[PDB]
Design a protein around this ligand. Structure first.
Ligand code: CHL
Ligand code: CHL
Ligand code: CHL
Ligand code: CLA
Ligand code: CLA
Ligand code: CLA
Ligand code: CLA
Ligand SMILES: CCCCCCCCCCCCCCCCCC(=O)OC[C@H](CO[C@@H]1O[C@H](CO)[C@H](O)[C@H](O)[C@H]1O)OC(=O)CCCCCCCCCCCCCCCCC
Ligand SMILES: CC1=C[C@H](O)CC(C)(C)[C@H]1/C=C/C(C)=C/C=C/C(C)=C/C=C/C=C(C)/C=C/C=C(C)/C=C/C1=C(C)C[C@H](O)CC1(C)C
Ligand SMILES: CC1=C[C@H](O)CC(C)(C)[C@H]1/C=C/C(C)=C/C=C/C(C)=C/C=C/C=C(C)/C=C/C=C(C)/C=C/C1=C(C)C[C@H](O)CC1(C)C
Ligand SMILES: CC1=C[C@H](O)CC(C)(C)[C@H]1/C=C/C(C)=C/C=C/C(C)=C/C=C/C=C(C)/C=C/C=C(C)/C=C/C1=C(C)C[C@H](O)CC1(C)C
Lengths: 219, 220, 238
């Protein structure tokens, strides 16, 4: 169903008395998980829903952006620094940050100008996101449409609802996976694809527990 | 000492007449009037936070006892390949695995993945039952169910129930504080809690935390 | 519509439209002209209201009150701290013989056997015991803050944030209610700047490892040469 009282929930069969009264099956991804009660106020709930969805979309883009260059890296492209948690240090290289390895594509040399342009454009677009602008004077803060649907996938309300659920769930998956990227880059020091390759090489010995005694103080 | 109502003991003592919020009526155990951050203004969030407090408290009491006990038993004679608590998990990677009390014949655990798998299975089952009930309860209280969890029957009187609630939550807050201390001072010191106490008792004035104060300075 | 000298900002005591930019509906907001729908609970009645509650944490008015008090107290402590993390280093580069003027190392001065001379002068405070220092401090600050939260020898029936009797407004700068209202904004804005800059002190310590004025100096030496991106690869996972 994914909506209403008979919806899928976070603990499955053991979830009848584990859902609060305020988590009516109205909003996408409502599996009934508010054990901490942080969304008891409807306004805080709305703000947290916006944070969830924006984090979700950004995390989907980032998951794809951390997976793609590494795949393309072994698939035959050079990628001076393919691993994602050092892809930013390419600016300090000899030839700068060449996009696909092509010295002719971007050839970025200064990180401060890159950052300046980024703050410029990102502030403009996020302020347009909060209060509108050239792409939406008065739309929904989360699902504006009408210029962010050039394909028109969600003109039916039922398709709209199911795609909302699909969106938020792929996004929660990506947020979990991006948290994993972070922790296991810090722990392992290698890329995600190389971590998968190493896990597939010897699943029983080079899992995370091989890196468990890494952060022990030991005087 | 009352522990309830308006004339209850409070977390700033005499200093506490006008700091307590209007919503912290002396109804619930451990209500000393400490919500300076206002995080429990909504009664529902307050209920959820009370559940989190009590569960953290119980888990922290068990964990405090579980970090103190093996070390005591360690110097009191018993073999403990790794007695210190923040390396008690790395026994699985030793030659003979994790022997419980040092006895090679007790448990002799060798694989951490299987240990973890059983743990997730039964912990999920138990915590789901805790949330919505099961073989040991259908519609009981989420925090103080009783029945199967009072085989001794200590809390059938409401007044004894209340005072034991306060005792529970206070021993638990003490244990949570002490477990936070275990964490920070294991990270800082790198030794066990009992050895930290022994070192503090050997030279209290120059074996305290301030001896490890310049430990985390960046220094370029 | 006005004359030249009123445009130029003359004639103090003409202030009732100057509170309009810091209180009320059409005030300055956190994204300026790109922040349309301010939270309804941020009505513009409190100082520093720029409409910033993206996370909706202050939706309850009572927790909003508690958060306001947290903000102002953090702001005052951070202002004192931002001034105190730069005063010793400035005074040391001007020539006062402070033995460790860097702030994140200033606490380790008490373990040198010459003690913690205040301005590097042994005739001054000359503290040797960090434990006695901490005990004195705990007693005094406990009394002080318990007096703050309910009342004490310096006024009991006063406001929790701006008591303003003869002990905490002894210069009478805030007897004019409009001056008070704009000084509240000045307080909270300088304090938010100080909190941000103290977060910056913390991060510049953990990252750079030098003093904040040393960081300013090495940035002013060659800014594009030396920046925070200079230390971007420092936390490389190995
Ligand atoms: C009945 C069986 C059942 C059980 C036990 C669970 C359990 C869970 N589901 Mg659920 N589900 C179940 C059925 C179903 N789920 C779902 C759909 C979902 C969704 C969409 C989601 C969940 C999520 C969750 C988790 C929420 C609680 C949590 O965050 O964990 C807290 C408890 C732990 C983290 C314990 C960790 C175990 C392990 C021992 C940790 C190891 C300890 C470390 C070594 C210590 C750390 C070291 C430090 C010092 C660095 C939880 C694991 C959520 C989730 O994935 O969050 C993670 C979530 O988003 N479920 C469906 C479809 C209808 C089900 C159908 O039956
Ligand atoms: C009138 C005297 C009196 C005073 C001053 C206090 C004060 C306190 N009581 Mg309280 N009580 C008092 C009487 C009583 N209490 C209680 C029962 C309780 C309980 C049950 C509890 C308290 C707690 C507290 C604390 C809550 C405030 C806080 O969290 O500090 C926050 C401020 C700080 C922590 C600042 C640090 C102080 C110190 C100088 C730290 C040193 C600085 C470090 C070097 C910094 C480290 C550097 C890092 C960043 C690298 C506080 C210490 C609570 C508690 O223990 O929480 C901690 C608590 O649970 N009291 C009773 C019985 C009725 C009293 C009887 O009169
Ligand atoms: C009795 C001695 C007493 C002492 C030594 C202090 C000392 C202090 N109070 Mg304090 N208070 C005292 C009683 C009281 N205070 C307060 C309410 C406050 C507030 C609301 C604040 C202070 C702050 C301060 C600090 C800044 C003083 C200042 O503004 O300088 C000007 C002269 C300082 C540590 C400030 C602080 O801690 O910020 C860092 C702060 O915001 N006090 C009340 C309730 C009206 C008191 C009642 O007796
Ligand atoms: C920052 C990201 C983020 C945010 C803001 C939210 C916010 C929300 N989620 Mg989502 N969620 C997320 C990530 C996030 N989630 C991820 C990654 C997963 C997969 C594990 C889920 C899975 C999930 C389910 C399955 C459900 C929700 C639900 C909710 C709502 C109620 C709970 C709440 O108030 O949490 C507030 C959250 C925070 C204050 C973030 C705190 C983060 C701290 C640091 C802990 C995180 C570390 C971890 C170890 C709320 C709108 C429930 C709902 O009603 O759906 C609409 C629901 O059923 N979420
Ligand atoms: C669905 C997401 C996802 C996927 C597919 C993987 C997959 C992998 N992770 Mg990552 N990881 C994730 C989420 C994920 N992780 C998250 C959320 C965290 C933070 C808790 C981590 C933290 C983490 C660390 C610290 C390490 C790995 C490692 C690994 C690899 C070995 C497996 C292992 O040790 O398990 C560890 C798994 C976890 C700690 C938690 C994930 C929970 C799973 C998804 C649920 C249980 C399912 C079972 C089948 C493997 C490629 C290790 C590696 O690089 O080996 C080569 C390693 O060192 N991961
Ligand atoms: C009641 C709980 C409890 C107990 C009994 C102890 C006991 C001890 N701790 Mg632990 N600790 C605790 C909580 C506790 N700690 C918590 C909550 C933290 C996190 C802030 C720490 C963090 C910590 C570190 C980082 C270190 C210790 C160390 C020590 C030992 C030396 C004492 C010291 O340096 O004081 C430090 C105490 C604190 C930092 C905070 C505890 C607050 C106490 C309980 C309240 C004050 C009571 C005190 C008697 C009154 C003093 C008044 C005045 C002098 C201030 C000693 C065995 C040191 C060690 O291993 O030496 C061998 C050490 O390096 N502890
Ligand atoms: C720039 C920062 C700033 C500003 C504009 C204000 C503004 C105000 N405060 Mg706040 N306050 C601040 C910082 C600030 N305060 C800090 C850091 C503390 C903690 C020490 C306090 C503690 C405090 C209390 C306890 C009270 C006020 C009160 C007031 C009001 C009247 C006093 C006044 O106009 O001061 C104007 C400020 C200046 C002209 C700045 C002077 C610069 C100093 C002297 C620099 C040197 C600092 C010194 C060495 C550090 C030792 C202390 C007004 C709203 C009172 C009030 O509202 O009652 C009606 C009140 O009760 N404030
Ligand atoms: C907080 C504590 C505040 C009180 C501190 C008292 C210090 C006691 C002491 O031992 O002093 C000892 C000190 C002298 O001590 C000398 O200090 C010097 C630096 O000042 C040097 O370090 C010398 O080495 C040291 O001998 O005595 C005095 O300074 C008191 C004289 C007061 C003169 C100022 C009067 C003006 C007052 C009116 C203006 C304000 C209204
Ligand atoms: C629900 C609930 C319930 C109860 O009640 C309470 C609680 C528990 C609290 C809750 C929970 C929550 C949670 C879990 C959360 C989580 C979150 C996350 C994980 C996020 C992520 C998130 C994530 C994210 C954003 C991500 C992002 C990403 C990105 C941007 C990326 C970027 C990039 C890339 C591409 C790579 C390159 O080279 C560079 C960079 C630049 C790096
Ligand atoms: C009240 C208030 C008020 C205002 O308003 C606001 C505020 C301030 C926020 C608040 C406060 C709060 C607080 C303080 C909190 C704290 C917490 C804690 C400390 C916890 C712990 C907690 C803790 C805990 C759980 C603990 C636990 C433990 C455990 C499990 C253990 C385990 C173990 C052991 C045995 C050992 C071995 O070898 C292993 C292991 C495995 C390791
Ligand atoms: C608004 C909003 C909105 C949405 O809705 C949500 C959110 C986002 C959450 C929000 C935000 C928030 C924030 C941003 C916060 C921040 C904070 C801070 C930064 C603080 C600091 C804070 C800071 C502070 C206190 C500071 C303090 C300081 C001090 C005491 C100092 C002391 C000292 C000194 C002098 C020096 C010496 O030698 C040493 C020491 C001892 C070191």
């Amino acid at each position: 169903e994914f909506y209403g009282p008979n919806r899928a929930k976070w603990l499955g069969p053991y979830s009848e008395n584990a859902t609060p009264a305020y988590l009516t099956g109205e909003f996408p991804g409502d599996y009934g998980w508010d054990t901490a009660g942080l969304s008891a106020d409807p306004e805080t709930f709305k703000r947290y829903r916006e944070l969830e969805l924006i984090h979700a979309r950004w995390a989907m883009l980032g998951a794809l952006g951390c997976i793609t260059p590494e795949l393309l890296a072994k698939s035959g492209t050079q990628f001076g620094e393919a691993v994602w948690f050092k892809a930013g240090a390419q600016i300090f290289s000899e030839g700068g940050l060449d996009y696909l390895g092509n010295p002719s594509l971007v050839h970025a040399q200064n990180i401060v100008a890159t950052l300046a342009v980024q703050v410029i454009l990102m502030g403009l677009v996020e302020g347009y996101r909060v209060n509108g602008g050239p792409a939406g004077e008065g739309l929904d803060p989360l699902y504006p449409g009408e210029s962010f649907d050039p394909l028109g996938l969600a003109d039916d309300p039922d398709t709209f609802a199911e795609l909302k659920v699909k969106e938020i769930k792929n996004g929660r998956l990506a947020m979990f996976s991006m948290f994993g990227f972070f922790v296991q880059a810090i722990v392992t020091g290698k890329g995600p694809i190389q971590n998968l390759d190493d896990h597939l090489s010897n699943p029983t010995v080079n899992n995370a527990f091989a890196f468990a005694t890494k952060f022990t103080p030991s005087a | 000492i009352e522990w309830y109502g308006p004339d209850r003991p409070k977390f700033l003592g005499p200093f506490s007449e006008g700091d307590t919020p209007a919503y912290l009526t002396g109804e619930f155990p451990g209500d000393y009037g400490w919500d300076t951050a206002g995080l429990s203004a909504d009664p529902e969030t307050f209920k959820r936070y009370r559940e989190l407090e009590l569960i953290h408290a119980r888990w922290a009491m068990l964990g405090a006892l579980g970090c103190i006990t093996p070390e005591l038993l360690a110097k009191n004679g018993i073999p403990f390949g790794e007695a210190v608590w923040f390396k008690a998990g790395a026994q699985i990677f030793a030659e003979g695995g994790l022997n419980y009390l040092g006895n090679e014949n007790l448990i002799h655990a060798q694989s951490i993945i299987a240990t973890l798998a059983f743990q997730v299975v039964v912990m999920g089952l138990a915590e789901a039952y805790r949330a919505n009930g099961g073989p040991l309860g259908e519609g009981l209280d989420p925090l103080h169910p009783g029945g199967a969890f009072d085989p001794l029957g200590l809390a059938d009187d409401p007044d004894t129930f209340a005072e034991l609630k306060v005792k529970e939550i206070k021993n638990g807050r003490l244990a949570m504080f002490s477990m936070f201390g275990f964490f920070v001072q294991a990270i800082v010191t790198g030794k066990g809690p009992i050895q930290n106490l022994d070192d503090h008792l050997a030279n209290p004035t120059a074996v305290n935390a301030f001896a490890y104060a310049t430990k985390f300075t960046p220094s370029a | 519509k006005k004359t030249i000298r009123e445009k130029a900002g003359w004639w103090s005591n003409g202030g009732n439209e100057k509170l309009s930019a810091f209180y009320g509906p059409d005030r300055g907001l956190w994204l300026g002209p790109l922040s349309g729908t301010t939270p309804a609970y941020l009505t513009g009645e409190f100082p520093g209201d720029y409409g910033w509650d993206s996370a909706g944490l202050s939706a309850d008015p009572e927790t909003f009150k508690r958060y306001r008090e947290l903000e102002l107290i953090h702001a005052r402590w951070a202002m004192l701290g931002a001034l105190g993390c730069i005063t010793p280093e400035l005074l040391a580069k001007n020539g006062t013989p402070i033995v460790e003027p860097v702030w994140f190392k200033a606490g380790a001065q008490i373990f040198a056997e010459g003690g913690l001379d205040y301005l590097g002068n042994p005739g001054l405070v000359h503290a040797q015991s960090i434990l006695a220092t901490l005990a004195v401090q705990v007693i005094l600050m406990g009394a002080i803050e318990g007096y703050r939260v309910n009342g004490g020898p310096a006024g009991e029936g006063l406001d929790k944030l701006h008591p303003g009797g003869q002990f905490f407004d002894p210069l009478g700068l805030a007897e004019d209610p409009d001056a008070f209202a704009e000084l509240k904004v000045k307080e909270i804005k300088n304090g938010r700047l100080a909190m941000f800059s103290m977060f910056g002190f913390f991060v510049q310590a953990i990252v750079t490892g030098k003093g904040p004025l040393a960081n300013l100096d090495e940035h002013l030496a060659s800014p594009f040469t030396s920046n925070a991106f200079t230390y971007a690869q420092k936390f490389t996972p190995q």
